[PDB]
Amino acid sequence: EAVKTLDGWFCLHDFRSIDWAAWRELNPGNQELMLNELSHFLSDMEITKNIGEGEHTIYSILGQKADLVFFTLRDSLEALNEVENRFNKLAIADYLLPTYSYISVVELSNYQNKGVRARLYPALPPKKHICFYPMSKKRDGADNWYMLPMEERQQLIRDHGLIGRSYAGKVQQIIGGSIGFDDYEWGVTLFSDDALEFKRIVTEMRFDEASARYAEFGSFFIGNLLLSEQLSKLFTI
Amino acid sequence: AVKTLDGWFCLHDFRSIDWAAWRELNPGNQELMLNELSHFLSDMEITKNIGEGEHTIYSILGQKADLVFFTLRDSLEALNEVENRFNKLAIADYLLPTYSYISVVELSNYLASHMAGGDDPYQNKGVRARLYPALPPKKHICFYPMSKKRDGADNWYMLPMEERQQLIRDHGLIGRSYAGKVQQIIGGSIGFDDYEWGVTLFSDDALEFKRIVTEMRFDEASARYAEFGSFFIGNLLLSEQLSKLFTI
Amino acid sequence: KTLDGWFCLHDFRSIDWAAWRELNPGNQELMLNELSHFLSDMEITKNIGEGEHTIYSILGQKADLVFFTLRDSLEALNEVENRFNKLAIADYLLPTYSYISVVELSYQNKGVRARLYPALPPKKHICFYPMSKKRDGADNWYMLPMEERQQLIRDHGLIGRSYAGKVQQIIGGSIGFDDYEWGVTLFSDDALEFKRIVTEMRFDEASARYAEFGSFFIGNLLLSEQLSKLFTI
Amino acid sequence: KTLDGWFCLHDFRSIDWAAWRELNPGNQELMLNELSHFLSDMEITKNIGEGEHTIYSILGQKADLVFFTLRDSLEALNEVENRFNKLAIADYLLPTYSYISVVELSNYYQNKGVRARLYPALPPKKHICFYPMSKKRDGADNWYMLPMEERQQLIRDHGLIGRSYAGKVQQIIGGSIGFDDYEWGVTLFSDDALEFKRIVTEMRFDEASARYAEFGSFFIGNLLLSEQLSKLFTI
Amino acid sequence: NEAVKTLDGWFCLHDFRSIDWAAWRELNPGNQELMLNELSHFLSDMEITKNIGEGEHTIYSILGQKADLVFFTLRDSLEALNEVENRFNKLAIADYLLPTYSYISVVELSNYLASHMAGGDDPYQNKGVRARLYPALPPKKHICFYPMSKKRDGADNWYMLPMEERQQLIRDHGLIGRSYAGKVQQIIGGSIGFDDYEWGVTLFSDDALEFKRIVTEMRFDEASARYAEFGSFFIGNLLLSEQLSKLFTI
Ligand code: FEC
Ligand code: FEC
Ligand code: FEC
Ligand code: FEC
Ligand code: FEC
Ligand code: NA
Ligand code: NA
Ligand code: NA
Ligand code: NA
Ligand code: NA
Numbered sequence A: 001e002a003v004k005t006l007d008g009w010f011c012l013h014d015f016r017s018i019d020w021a022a023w024r025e026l027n028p029g030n031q032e033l034m035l036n037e038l039s040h041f042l043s044d045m046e047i048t049k050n051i052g053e054g055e056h057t058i059y060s061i062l063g064q065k066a067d068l069v070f071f072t073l074r075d076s077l078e079a080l081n082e083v084e085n086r087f088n089k090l091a092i093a094d095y096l097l098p099t100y101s102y103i104s105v106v107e108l109s110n111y112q113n114k115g116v117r118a119r120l121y122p123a124l125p126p127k128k129h130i131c132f133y134p135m136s137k138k139r140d141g142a143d144n145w146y147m148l149p150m151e152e153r154q155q156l157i158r159d160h161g162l163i164g165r166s167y168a169g170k171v172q173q174i175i176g177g178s179i180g181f182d183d184y185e186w187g188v189t190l191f192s193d194d195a196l197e198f199k200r201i202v203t204e205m206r207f208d209e210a211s212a213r214y215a216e217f218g219s220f221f222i223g224n225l226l227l228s229e230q231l232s233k234l235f236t237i
Numbered sequence B: 001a002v003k004t005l006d007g008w009f010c011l012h013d014f015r016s017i018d019w020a021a022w023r024e025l026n027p028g029n030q031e032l033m034l035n036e037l038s039h040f041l042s043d044m045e046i047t048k049n050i051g052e053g054e055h056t057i058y059s060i061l062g063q064k065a066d067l068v069f070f071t072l073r074d075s076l077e078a079l080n081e082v083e084n085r086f087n088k089l090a091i092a093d094y095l096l097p098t099y100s101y102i103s104v105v106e107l108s109n110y111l112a113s114h115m116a117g118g119d120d121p122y123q124n125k126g127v128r129a130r131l132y133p134a135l136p137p138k139k140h141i142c143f144y145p146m147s148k149k150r151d152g153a154d155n156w157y158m159l160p161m162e163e164r165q166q167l168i169r170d171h172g173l174i175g176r177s178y179a180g181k182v183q184q185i186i187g188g189s190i191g192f193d194d195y196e197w198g199v200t201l202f203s204d205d206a207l208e209f210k211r212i213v214t215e216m217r218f219d220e221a222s223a224r225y226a227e228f229g230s231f232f233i234g235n236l237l238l239s240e241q242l243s244k245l246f247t248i
Numbered sequence C: 001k002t003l004d005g006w007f008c009l010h011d012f013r014s015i016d017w018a019a020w021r022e023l024n025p026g027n028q029e030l031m032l033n034e035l036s037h038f039l040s041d042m043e044i045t046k047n048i049g050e051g052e053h054t055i056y057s058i059l060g061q062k063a064d065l066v067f068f069t070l071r072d073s074l075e076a077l078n079e080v081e082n083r084f085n086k087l088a089i090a091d092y093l094l095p096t097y098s099y100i101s102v103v104e105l106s107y108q109n110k111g112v113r114a115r116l117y118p119a120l121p122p123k124k125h126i127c128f129y130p131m132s133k134k135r136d137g138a139d140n141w142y143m144l145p146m147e148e149r150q151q152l153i154r155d156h157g158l159i160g161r162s163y164a165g166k167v168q169q170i171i172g173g174s175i176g177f178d179d180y181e182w183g184v185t186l187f188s189d190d191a192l193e194f195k196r197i198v199t200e201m202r203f204d205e206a207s208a209r210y211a212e213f214g215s216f217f218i219g220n221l222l223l224s225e226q227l228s229k230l231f232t233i
Numbered sequence D: 001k002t003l004d005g006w007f008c009l010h011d012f013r014s015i016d017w018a019a020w021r022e023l024n025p026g027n028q029e030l031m032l033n034e035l036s037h038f039l040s041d042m043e044i045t046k047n048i049g050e051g052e053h054t055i056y057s058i059l060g061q062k063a064d065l066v067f068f069t070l071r072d073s074l075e076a077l078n079e080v081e082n083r084f085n086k087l088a089i090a091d092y093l094l095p096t097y098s099y100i101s102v103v104e105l106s107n108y109y110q111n112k113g114v115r116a117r118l119y120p121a122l123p124p125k126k127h128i129c130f131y132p133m134s135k136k137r138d139g140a141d142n143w144y145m146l147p148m149e150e151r152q153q154l155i156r157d158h159g160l161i162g163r164s165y166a167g168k169v170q171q172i173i174g175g176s177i178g179f180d181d182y183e184w185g186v187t188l189f190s191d192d193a194l195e196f197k198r199i200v201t202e203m204r205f206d207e208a209s210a211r212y213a214e215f216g217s218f219f220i221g222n223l224l225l226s227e228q229l230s231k232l233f234t235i
Numbered sequence E: 001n002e003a004v005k006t007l008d009g010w011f012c013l014h015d016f017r018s019i020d021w022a023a024w025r026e027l028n029p030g031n032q033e034l035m036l037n038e039l040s041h042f043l044s045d046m047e048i049t050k051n052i053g054e055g056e057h058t059i060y061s062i063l064g065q066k067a068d069l070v071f072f073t074l075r076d077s078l079e080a081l082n083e084v085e086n087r088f089n090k091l092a093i094a095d096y097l098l099p100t101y102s103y104i105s106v107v108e109l110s111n112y113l114a115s116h117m118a119g120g121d122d123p124y125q126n127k128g129v130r131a132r133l134y135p136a137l138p139p140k141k142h143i144c145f146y147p148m149s150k151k152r153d154g155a156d157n158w159y160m161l162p163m164e165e166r167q168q169l170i171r172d173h174g175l176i177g178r179s180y181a182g183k184v185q186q187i188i189g190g191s192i193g194f195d196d197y198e199w200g201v202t203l204f205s206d207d208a209l210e211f212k213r214i215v216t217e218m219r220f221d222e223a224s225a226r227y228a229e230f231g232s233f234f235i236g237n238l239l240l241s242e243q244l245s246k247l248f249t250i
Helices: A020-025 A028-050 A077-088 A091-095 A114-120 A150-165 A196-206 A209-214 A228-235 B019-023 B027-049 B076-087 B090-094 B125-131 B161-176 B207-217 B239-245 C017-021 C025-047 C074-086 C088-092 C110-116 C146-162 C192-202 C205-210 C224-231 D017-022 D025-047 D074-086 D088-092 D112-118 D148-163 D194-204 D226-233 E021-026 E029-051 E078-089 E092-096 E127-133 E163-178 E208-219 E241-248
Strands: A005-018 A054-061 A068-074 A096-109 A129-137 A172-177 A186-192 A215-217 A221-225 B004-017 B053-060 B067-073 B095-108 B140-148 B183-188 B197-203 B226-228 B232-236 C003-015 C051-058 C065-071 C093-105 C125-133 C168-173 C182-188 C211-213 C217-221 D002-015 D051-058 D065-071 D093-106 D127-135 D170-175 D184-190 D213-215 D219-223 E006-019 E055-062 E069-075 E097-110 E142-150 E185-190 E199-205 E228-230 E234-238
Touching: A005 A054, A005 A077, A005 A114, A005 A172, A005 A186, A005 E208, A020 A091, A020 B090, A028 A054, A028 A077, A028 A091, A028 A228, A054 A129, A054 A228, A068 A077, A068 A129, A068 A221, A077 E234, A091 A096, A091 E021, A096 A114, A096 A186, A129 A196, A150 A196, A150 A209, A186 A196, A196 A209, A196 B004, A209 A215, A221 B076, B004 B053, B004 B076, B004 B125, B004 B183, B004 B197, B019 B090, B019 C088, B027 B053, B027 B076, B027 B090, B027 B239, B053 B140, B053 B239, B067 B076, B067 B140, B090 B095, B095 B125, B095 B197, B140 B207, B161 B207, B197 B207, B232 C074, C003 C051, C003 C074, C003 C110, C003 C168, C003 C182, C017 C088, C017 D074, C017 D088, C025 C051, C025 C074, C025 C088, C025 C224, C051 C125, C051 C224, C065 C074, C065 C125, C074 C088, C088 C093, C093 C110, C093 C182, C125 C192, C146 C192, C146 C205, C182 C192, C192 C205, C192 D002, C205 C211, C217 D074, D002 D051, D002 D074, D002 D112, D002 D170, D002 D184, D017 D088, D017 E092, D025 D051, D025 D074, D025 D088, D025 D226, D051 D127, D051 D226, D065 D074, D065 D127, D065 D219, D074 D088, D088 D093, D093 D112, D093 D184, D127 D194, D148 D194, D184 D194, D194 E006, D219 E078, E006 E055, E006 E078, E006 E127, E006 E185, E006 E199, E021 E092, E029 E055, E029 E078, E029 E092, E029 E241, E055 E142, E055 E241, E069 E078, E069 E142, E069 E234, E092 E097, E097 E127, E097 E199, E142 E208, E163 E208, E199 E208
Parallel strands: none
Antiparallel strands: A005 A068, A005 A096, A054 A068, A054 A221, A096 A172, A129 A186, A129 A215, A129 A221, A172 A186, B004 B067, B004 B095, B053 B067, B053 B232, B095 B183, B140 B197, B140 B226, B140 B232, B183 B197, C003 C065, C003 C093, C051 C065, C051 C217, C093 C168, C125 C182, C125 C211, C125 C217, C168 C182, D002 D065, D002 D093, D051 D065, D051 D219, D093 D170, D127 D184, D127 D213, D127 D219, D170 D184, E006 E069, E006 E097, E055 E069, E055 E234, E097 E185, E142 E199, E142 E228, E142 E234, E185 E199
8 A cells, every 4th residue: 555665865954043133242253253164064065065975055034934944965864963963063053043944855756767866866956946845644534645545546646746747847846755754744845946936836736636635734934045145145244 | 726916025024022122222222223224114115116115014912023014025035135134133133023924915816807818917007006016004904824724525725616716706795895994915825934825904993804804704715714823913103103112 | 793892902921030039129119119100090091981901910820910901992002012011110021922802792872881891890800711613614603694693692691691790701802803703801709600601601502512712811800919919029 | 510629720840950050059058948938838728728739740841840739719829829939949940831720529518528529638649640631522522512411421431430540549630611721630649650541541442531532731740758859959 | 442451661751952052162171071071970870770670771863953862761660760860950961951852651562462372471570571661772773753642533533443443453553563573673652641642652773764664654554544643753863972972072
């Protein structure tokens, strides 16, 4: 009955809110020293990316939920844990308050193939916007995904796939499975150069039976790509 | 599935004033920080006057917040830049974040907003007035988010289009009967925030908020399918109300 | 269809004893003096008929105090709240919950005016909770026909009548104003009457099937003397 | 309809060890002495029959301690709470949960057995269990829409289970409709903590709870007398 | 109708902590060392209790913001468990270990299936049963913890089911778990009366993806598909003394 999956990089979505009042009290010398240390940390992460042992990206997040997200991908939970712990021990991380996080593993569902590695070990596209949200499938009375027969689930997933293929080109998706790893069953990351495409695809999916009847959603997070010019501007008072 | 036209990107930024910290400042430094905020708001007025956005400030009743800063911009980048520049104001250390909402001004296709044809609606001046709304200086504001239910037999997203259209039509008739008393901005937020719409109402009589929201609750579109978040009510704040508000 | 009266704020506060204790007694006295001035101001608004207010001490950790204020506009209620938060002593009164509503009755008449603009009875105890009516499957209040709801409300009213002289109720409507649909304030000189009336109503179909309840807060009347004792540390 | 006895406060606290640790031992001793005089005053009220109180240490992070106090009026209970909060040591006792209720006897005052139940002596049992609960009002599972006779039968079967734990678990049922966020506060006392798991599991398979019970958080702990109270606070 | 009966072993604490890096960074290295020395002394005391057979314990570093560390401790009484918790909180270093979540439970073996022959024997004298009630913790690379309860929701009400139907549902769930022998080791802690859910579930594995595999497969089995209500999930990596010293080095 059960889905069987292929699993790739382990993923951390780390959402932080900047403690502006504390940061403002820091002398501008201390601020520069802490950003220099962060900049070294990010150069090391870029090395890991260039040799193909992981990926990462940073977006600034709208609204009060976060000021930024660090999305990091590694080939083991141990390497992910070490990134996280080294990040938290940066001086600047004392000013980066934790507001939400998500742990997942890039997932390919069965519903060395170079076309599989590309999905399992995704290079992150440098699109202007990111959207993240977690979700689960419902187990609620007669709307119970996990009691459906495989044939009916397969039909529902087929229809859902047709919609997303029509957004190829506009929206790039990474689906992280998180059963056993976090509080929902998937973490969904979307990338696009037009944020309205996130609204468009997620709305269209909500009227397809697989989501209309069976999706349960967490919080949504949207943001804008942060390279270094925007990162340094971000922190300048 | 519903199709939408989409206009300005919206931030409702709710803040609570840290009176105890503010009180610790001497009035000289308080004035300096208020001057910096006025300069900030003067810049926001320029953006408004060149047609690139809108903004307004209301004082909020109860402990949920003291103020809301409602800001509208033509891109997420611009909205993000306002937000970040605002948090970096000196006075913002005394404005504690208590809630926020991200949405985009939305016109659905459940009813027609213009004569059908190849003529594209973004060039229709009536449509543009709705997508890029002028904010009216009404005495009061009401904000809340909402979603449509997907709950057993009450599942909005499993209804056929013609049934959703009828439900929306009937909802619209009620709202139309509050013309001249309540003005509404509907921000779509599927993909952007935790509910599916952020609803902003404006009126000179706060009791019209209770009236319309109650009346709609007995209409099937809301009675059967609405799920509501928290409600925020407040009073218009111009400069007079603002420096007054911060005089301790 | 409802008639609407005073706008209401229930403002729950927990006292920051650790910080209060750090103040020398002279500064404590100055802050209490300021608070008494503010409260005498509130009493003046009451005595000219432009509002009401009362203060109860709250049991349990949810709060130490509730300030229940009623005013004739949202602007006036906002000004009171803001002037309150600017008192020096308010820095020691940490906000733990609040509720916004308007007195509701479903205008020249004196018995109506007595309901819409209620005098607050000096009863020993208070009980506050918000509630809404369910929209949940077959238990959907707002999908009922008019005449079915009228019958359900009728029966709930008979119960209330039997508590005349035991419990006095103020019902604030809050659709459009806060997170639930009504704020319910009860006053009695016997706190057990709160339990009795609210239990009795819970077996009546209007509440048994359709009520959704928030948190409950219960308290004891604070006059000037009990206020000074409260803060003596 | 019910009979109602003492008003009850369950007051859960976590100790601020970092701040307590900053105090020199003489000041720590002065604050504990003040708490000792407060508890000896509480013992006078207990000895005269005007209330009761006990203290248990609580397992896990929800609390370090529970102060469970019973008084014959809401005013007396409020006065205990406020005096407690104004103890110097209370700055180090952070409030993490509380519950207000009244000892309850349903019909599903001069009698000596009735009075022993309304105004209960707290047994010095090794362990305590506290949890609040309400009866469901959810579609076909609606306790408050049941006919009186069906409810009487469901309570009867529930009481049969409780009777079989006589001598193992002692229970205090506090009504809280009108007073706190659930409908009852349930306090269990036993010398064997597994009896809590046994009685609560067995009740959960009895229809009255299987269909109709809605539970809040559960707290368990160990009796703290004077001996153990001093060691709790010794760093 | 017929309630489950259980055998119950060690009382358990799952104690999740987040490290207050900002505060820890402000200590000079000499004082950090003293605090880590004291912690090592407390852990060697834990080890002594393990090595005389009166309890167990283990430490994992947790991924994500929910915690940096979990301390999982097992003891033969609630008093001993409470004493360990209180001594831990009074360590100097514990000021830097902020509480983010905890769970209290007791190692549970129910009677849905047999764990030993019904020949009249004391199950607590059966060494196989004892190995389960007083489990030695395996030094597997990864841990997974989550609490869960069984639904009492309309037509999906576990506690209204007949014994023989619950037994069938448990039986089928067990066959799935049996298929993960050698890949996932489970400890089931019962928590009815002790904490906010009905069980705490701890999984150990050298491959974290086996957690995802077993929990996903059980979620398509009726016992969980229809009746499970889950709390939060925590996953982590084994921490021995060496990884502990690295964790706290800035
Ligand atoms: C966005 C978004 C969501 C979450 C929102 C919602 O669920 O409402 C979303 C949700 C899910 C979820 C769960 C699953 C897994 C469900 C399960 O395993 O039971 C899940 C699984 C699949 N998705 Fe999915 N998605 N999705 C896209 C975007 C979104 N998708 C785009 C775009 C494409 C197309 C691009 C591509 O395939 O490379 C796409 C295609 C697939 C295919 C391939 C189908 C096919 O080949 O026909 C599978 C399998
Ligand atoms: C207030 C309020 C709420 C939220 C509370 C509740 O819905 O219970 C409220 C909620 C919503 C929600 C969601 C939606 C989007 C639903 C969807 O796209 O599924 C949503 C969408 C629409 N509303 Fe709405 N509303 N609303 C008014 C006030 C409120 N409205 C007033 C006033 C007018 C009248 C404007 C006028 O004067 O011409 C009005 C009209 C419309 C129209 C135009 C319909 C038509 O043309 O007939 C659309 C589309
Ligand atoms: C207590 C309590 C609650 C909340 C708990 C619950 O509803 O379970 C409570 C709740 C409500 C709620 C909502 C409503 C409005 C519901 C709606 O409009 O849909 C609501 C409305 C009414 N109540 Fe109510 N109550 N209530 C009393 C106490 C409580 N009442 C007592 C006492 C009296 C006795 C009357 C008196 O002597 O003054 C009494 C009477 C009325 C009347 C009488 C008709 C009239 O206003 O002309 C109306 C209408
Ligand atoms: C434990 C526990 C709970 C909460 C957990 C759950 O509900 O699953 C629990 C829950 C409740 C609740 C509510 C009520 C009231 C519900 C209502 O009035 O609607 C409630 C009410 C009663 N209980 Fe109850 N209980 N309970 C015991 C333990 C527990 N009890 C033990 C032990 C005895 C043994 C009695 C004795 O000491 O003489 C016992 C007996 C009674 C009687 C006895 C009446 C009679 O003598 O015929 C009444 C009435
Ligand atoms: C993983 C996981 C979960 C939680 C996730 C979920 O969806 O359930 C999980 C959840 C639970 C829960 C509650 C219960 C208690 C059910 C109840 O008493 O209502 C519960 C109870 C049992 N489990 Fe369970 N599990 N489980 C395994 C893994 C998981 N298990 C593995 C592996 C094995 C295989 C062991 C082996 O053969 O070596 C295994 C077997 C059993 C047996 C059979 C042995 C016995 O009599 O104790 C019982 C009973
Ligand atoms: Na932000
Ligand atoms: Na306010
Ligand atoms: Na209190
Ligand atoms: Na504890
Ligand atoms: Na972590």
